[PDB]
Amino acid sequence: WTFSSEEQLARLRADANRKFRCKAVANGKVLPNDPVFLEPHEEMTLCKYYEKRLLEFCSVFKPAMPRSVVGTACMYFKRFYLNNSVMEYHPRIIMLTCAFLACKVDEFNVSSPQFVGNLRESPLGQEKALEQILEYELLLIQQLNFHLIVHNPYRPFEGFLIDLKTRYPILENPEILRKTADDFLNRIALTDAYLLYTPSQIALTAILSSASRAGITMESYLSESLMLKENRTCLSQLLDIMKSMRNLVKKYEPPRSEEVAVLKQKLERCHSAELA
Amino acid sequence: WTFSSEEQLARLRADANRKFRCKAVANGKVLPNDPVFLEPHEEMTLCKYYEKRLLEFCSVFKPAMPRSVVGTACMYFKRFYLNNSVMEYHPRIIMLTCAFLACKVDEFNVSSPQFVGNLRESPLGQEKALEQILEYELLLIQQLNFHLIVHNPYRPFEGFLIDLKTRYPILENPEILRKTADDFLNRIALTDAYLLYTPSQIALTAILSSASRAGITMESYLSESLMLKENRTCLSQLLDIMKSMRNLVKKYEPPRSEEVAVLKQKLERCHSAELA
Q1: Distance (Å, rounded) from C-alpha A238 to C-alpha A229?
Q2: What would you measure as the largest C-alpha separation in chain A, in angstroms?
Q3: Is the domain B151-251 a CATH 3.30.70.980 member?
Q4: Where are the Phosphoserine residues found in this chain (chains A, B)?
Q5: Residue B135 contacts A, CB cutoff 8 Å
Q6: CA B69, CA B58: separation in Å to the nearest integer?
Q7: C-beta atoms of A112 and B101 within 8 A
Q8: B1-150+252-276 and B151-251 share one CATH topology?
Q9: H helices within chain A, ranges in order?
């Protein structure tokens, strides 16, 4: 859900990285800040990586998985790691748990044995994964403070596509708009916008910034609108926000091909230094 | 947790039995109240049965399972069925789920594979049970309204045993008191007292009513006390409550040996009439 700033989210993850290190040295298990630990910065990379990995999983998922489920799963994952160190709870498990919790809260009819079946491994490997999800379900639920309700952009998105193709029937061919805006939603999802802005003023930013990329512009759409342009009363707020967001996607640096393998390597060193 | 009355708990389970029947005829799936359905009365029997069955499971559990866990598991189970029909969610699964949720919220270090291992069946049968628990965990959590914190009598019990053997050192041999009071706690647990009275004024009722059964009586214990006698300010309330409770255990009729097999038989007829 929407927080105040990006620094507020940076301090949160900091407190989570810190808190684990202290309670790591809290059994003389590790040299007071020895090379085993990851920096908050090294945590985010791994998470960016695992969310990317979450999206892939969700895309090949059979039976076809709804946009909202995937979107819900991403939020659980992001919000968990705002207060938990990846050195404590592994993201491969927590992402998978996030997906399962999501299929469940969303009432997306899928059975755990059908869920786990999308994993690329042996029948026992799949079952093991299932057991691990069981292990972490209450925890994830607890870490999200029992608030499992998540509102996605998908709904508002379809709202604006209806509105636009209606006010502008030349754009009755906005089924070209859709794909490009989709491409932009997926990119923005990977950022902290989910935790920082409304899914409405997020979906708006997808339609508009896509149409525009495709040359078109409706000089009076925002003069008009769909549910208060489904965003900030003052047009200005709306405008700098779509700017901010377009910025967020612009500064986004994807998980490093190599850093990830080293970080994955460090991550296990914590999962072997025996709780350190 | 403590409700107002026993009729309030009877109406709740009624609304749960009713609500399922209506939404059962709600697809012409069944003759508007045909012989398939169970009566609230037939629901309670099955639940009494399954809780008895829960206790057994919990008793042979390895590694040894704490008093509180078992007690917690019983509450989840009772409170779930205050708003859910056994025709909708089977008690064999929900009781097992209740136990697992309990080991988890109580931080009783047991792994699902260790948990499920106490089941008397094949490795795949055990795994299946594990999958089923996964299926129902969020639901149980949702049905308890996210309130998983449960206070047991065990703590207050040990409080009064400390108090009594202290004020009366002839009763420094109350480790005879313990067993008989334990016998009485287990009996009272099987009733709705858990949902109707404080675990303190429940534990008190165990000590006192046991000591008394063993002839002894401290004519001034309640004149004195352990944490406000850990119960009602007015001694009277305290006294009729211990009466009420001693009554609850007195009118308790255990699940019928034969009715259970027929009811179990009916229960599956609902689990085959395809949601009816």
Answers
A1: 9
A2: 69
A3: no
A4: 122
A5: yes
A6: 9
A7: no
A8: yes
A9: 6-25, 40-60, 67-80, 91-105, 112-115, 123-143, 154-167, 177-189, 193-196, 200-213, 235-251, 257-270
